[PDB]
Structure formats: structure tokens, C-alpha cells
Write a protein that binds this DNA or RNA. Structure first.
Length: 368
RNA sequence: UUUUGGUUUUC
């Protein structure tokens, strides 16, 4: 902190980076003000850091202001600036493409990260043909696809249902000497599980280790989820144990099991898992409470579901739109209660398709 | 010092 050593702009950028990635955007922004007050000019990296923090914190519009502020100052937005906005716009919407042409008009060549950012956006938007189009184009520009590039297309193909094309594209990635990492293998493993081929997924998982590729928690979470969906609830509890025998399970690990257990009716074993993660200092997020609220709702235990909603609120976890979609749906026949909860998420500041669909079908069989 | 890929919830 302090410090007879005068901080550099590099010093504030690091702290601003750490603050933004800790959600602490308001605290990340007072640092911005402090540094001008000392006569230390925020640079392009300073704006790019705050812009990224704003996008990932869902304040896209606030980030677009910062882009305008920097331009007004003569602090030129660069390839990183555009890459940051393009991803931010993709993840919110697919505006990102006008920036991809705008950056070229500023003399900024798009790079491998730009192409990777847009290929993913196009896939997650159902525009896989468009994404494959960009893949061809970047090889034309002499941009060499990397492990992220090939992993983004393998994911999209799988999620579109083109698992064998995914398997084919992975094959050529080793031909070109691009070494797959744990994210690559997990993506194929997730794809095989989503496609009902659990043993082909374990075969690959073992091939991942024999290649010397160490799994992480996502890998096991992916594998555990495949086991819960497949109905292999015990083999997924085995995997949760074997996991430690040295990977630390995380919240998503617990969320996945808690969900498998809820959907099977094993509400007890779910609640004691929810108790174990807390005691183990693993904080339940919003999916944790969403999973249990739906579980208790589908089971006919709405009072306990509402009880759990309060407790989630009584603990600083903010309920999102899934929370309300679940509860709103859950009250089928507490007409006004359901309607009540809809206005409450408006006042809380949560953008509502399912929400509207559920309220109207509630209004109708109750023309309002 | 800043930007891109993989896992869980409202079926």
C-alpha cells in the first residue's frame, strides 16, 4: 500500500485489476479517482481493466461510457479494448459484430483472440455456420488457430449435436501439433456425456491421464454430472470420494450432486450435502438455493421452498431470475402470491421469456 | 499490469 516510493500507473492498474476481479468495482473505481488526484494518468490498460470488470459484472452500459470517456481523452482504444467489448457484447448482444468492423476501420487488425471471441459468440448464438465461416477467414489472414480456437469449435459442434465432427476436428488439432489441454478433453467428455455415451467419456477421461493431462475440478464436476443425469447416483458419489483421494471439490461439485439427489427424491442426502459444503467453508451460491427450491417445489414442499428462499435472502445471496421463475412457476395455485413475486423481482432490478410465459399462463387460468 | 475456450439450477 504505502509507501518514499512514488507509485507507477502499473501499480494502480494491478490493484484495479485485483479489485475488479473481486467484484469490488466501486472500490476499484475510487482508486481510479485517487490516481488522477496525484497527477498519475490512467492509461489504455487502466481503461481496459475497468471496462472488463464492468462487462463481467454485468454493467455493460457503464463500460461503454468508459470507452467514450477514453476516446474523448485521446487515449486510443486498441485491439484489447475492442476484444473486451466484443466479448462483453456477445455475452449480454451478438453490436459485437459492428465493433469487429469498427476496429478494422481504426487500423486495428483483429487477432487470434478477436476471432476466438467471435467464434464462441457465434456458436453460443446458434450461428455455428457463421463461426466455421470465421475459422476459415482467420487462416486466410494468416492467423494461426490455437488450442482455444480448436476447443471453441469442438464445444460448439458438440453442443449443436455434431459430436463426430467434434471428434474429427480434435483429431486434426493434434495433426497440426496443437497440444490439447484439460479444457479440450473436458469439452469432449462433456459432449459425450450430453450424448448419452458415458463409457466413451470415461475412456477419453482415462486417455487424458495417460497422455499426462491432469484433470481439474471442472473435469470431475463434468463427469459427476454425467453420472447423475445417467441415473448412476452411486457411481457419482464414488467419483466425489475418489476425487479427493487430490482435487478439492468446489461449489459446482456440491451443486451438481445436490441436484442429482433432489431430482431422484433423495431430499435428505441433498440437504446434508448442503450442510457439509457450508461446514467445509464452501459457500453456497445462487444455483445452490435454486436447485433446492426447485427440488422442494416439484416435491410438493412449497412452504420449505419459500423457507429456503428467505434463508438465502437472510444470508446475502441475491436471488436471480431462475430463483423467481422457479418460485413463480412453483405457485400453481397461489395466484396472487405468484403474481406478487413477479413485481418483487422487478423492484429488485432483475430482467425477466420463462417469467412472462409463466405469469400469463397464471393470469389466464385464473384474460388479464 | 488488462481481453478469448470446458462443468451445476428454472425440462
Amino acid at each position: 500500500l504505502r509507501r518514499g516510493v512514488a507509485p507507477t500507473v502499473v501499480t494502480y492498474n494491478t490493484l484495479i485489476d485485483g479489485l475488479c476481479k473481486a467484484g469490488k468495482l466501486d472500490e476499484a473505481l475510487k482508486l481510479f479517482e485517487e490516481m488522477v488526484e496525484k497527477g498519475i494518468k490512467p492509461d489504455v490498460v487502466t481503461y481496459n481493466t475497468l471496462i472488463d470488470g464492468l462487462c463481467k459484472a454485468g454493467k455493460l452500459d457503464e463500460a461503454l461510457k468508459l470507452f467514450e470517456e477514453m476516446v474523448e481523452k485521446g487515449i486510443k482504444p486498441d485491439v484489447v479494448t475492442y476484444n473486451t467489448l466484443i466479448d462483453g457484447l456477445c455475452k449480454a448482444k451478438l453490436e459485437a459484430l459492428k465493433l469487429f468492423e469498427e476496429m478494422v476501420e481504426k487500423g486495428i487488425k483483429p487477432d487470434v483472440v478477436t476471432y476466438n471471441t467471435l467464434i464462441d459468440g457465434l456458436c453460443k448464438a446458434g450461428k455455428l455456420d457463421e463461426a466455421l465461416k470465421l475459422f476459415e477467414e482467420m487462416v486466410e489472414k494468416g492467423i494461426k488457430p490455437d488450442v482455444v480456437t480448436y476447443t471453441t469449435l469442438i464445444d460448439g459442434l458438440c453442443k449443436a449435436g455434431k459430436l463426430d465432427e467434434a471428434l474429427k476436428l480434435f483429431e486434426e488439432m493434434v495433426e497440426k501439433g496443437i497440444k490439447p489441454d484439460v479444457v479440450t478433453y473436458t469439452t469432449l467428455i462433456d459432449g459425450l456425456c450430453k450424448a448419452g455415451k458415458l463409457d466413451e467419456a470415461l475412456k477419453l477421461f482415462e486417455e487424458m491421464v495417460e497422455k499426462g493431462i491432469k484433470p481439474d475440478v471442472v473435469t470431475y464436476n463434468t463427469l459427476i454430472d454425467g453420472l447423475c443425469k445417467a441415473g448412476k447416483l452411486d457411481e457419482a458419489l464414488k467419483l466425489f470420494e475418489e476425487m479427493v483421494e487430490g482435487i478439492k471439490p468446489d461449489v459446482v461439485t456440491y451443486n451438481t450432486l445436490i441436484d442429482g439427489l433432489c431430482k431422484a427424491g433423495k431430499l435428505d442426502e441433498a440437504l446434508k450435502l448442503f450442510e457439509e459444503m457450508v461446514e467445509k467453508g464452501i459457500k453456497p451460491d445462487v444455483v445452490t438455493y435454486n436447485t433446492l427450491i426447485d427440488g422442494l417445489c416439484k416435491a410438493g414442499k412449497l412452504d420449505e421452498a419459500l423457507k429456503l428462499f428467505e434463508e438465502m435472502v437472510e444470508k446475502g445471496i441475491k436471488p436471480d431470475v431462475v430463483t423467481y421463475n422457479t418460485l413463480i412457476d412453483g405457485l400453481c395455485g397461489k395466484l396472487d402470491e405468484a403474481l406478487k413475486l413477479f413485481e418483487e423481482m422487478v423492484e429488485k432490478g432483475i430482467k425477466p421469456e420463462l417469467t412472462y410465459r409463466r405469469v400469463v399462463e397464471s393470469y389466464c387460468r385464473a384474460e388479464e
